[PDB]
Design a protein around this ligand. Structure first.
Ligand code: ZN
Ligand code: ZN
Ligand code: ZN
Length: 178
């Protein structure tokens, strides 16, 4: 196995995948690393199995159809993995915990949102369709853009949204366009 967490790139108390070389902190893996299960297979491994079981699942899809999918186990897993891909970027720190808003000339968002809130909402099965999860994720970045206005810090929202959107297109096999 690797000697650092795949998500945060730090050492520590690492749980090791049995089917690939990755390792994880317990609360860095999504879902949190399971109590028993020997062998244990990480989310990367579980996503690759889905693809291998149904190769046609990589054919292009329309985003509108993806969003309307119910959160059955395979879509639940895909959202977990997309969330994890965002935490993989170090810039996710800015969006992880509950924000607060007190800047001259701006007003906070009507509906604050943050990664750990989305993580809880997935864990508690609060989303019934893919659209629920994607809306809350895009809301994080939209709130940041609107609040920070012309401050150059707005760019952090653009950057981490780009990571989200590239991974969304990959994981859900969105049809490539010009
Ligand atoms: Zn970690
Ligand atoms: Zn693995
Ligand atoms: Zn098949």
């Amino acid at each position: 196995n690797s000697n650092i967490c795949e998500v945060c790139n730090k050492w520590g108390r690492l749980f090791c995948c049995d089917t690939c070389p990755r390792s994880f902190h317990e609360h860095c893996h999504i879902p949190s690393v399971e109590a028993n299960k020997n062998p244990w297979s990480c989310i990367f491994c579980r996503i690759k199995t889905i693809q291998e079981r149904c190769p046609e699942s990589q054919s292009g899809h329309q985003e509108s159809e993806v969003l309307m999918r119910q959160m059955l186990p395979e879509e639940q897993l895909k959202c977990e993995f997309l969330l994890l891909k965002v935490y993989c970027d170090s810039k996710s720190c800015f969006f992880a915990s509950e924000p607060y808003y007190n800047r001259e000339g701006s007003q906070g968002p009507q509906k604050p949102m943050w990664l750990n809130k989305v993580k809880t909402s997935l864990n508690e099965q609060m989303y019934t369709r893919v659209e629920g999860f994607v809306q809350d994720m895009r809301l994080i970045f939209h709130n940041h853009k609107e609040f920070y206005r012309e401050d150059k810090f707005t760019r952090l929202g653009i950057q981490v949204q780009d990571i989200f959107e590239k991974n969304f297109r990959n994981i859900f096999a969105i049809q490539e366009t010009s």
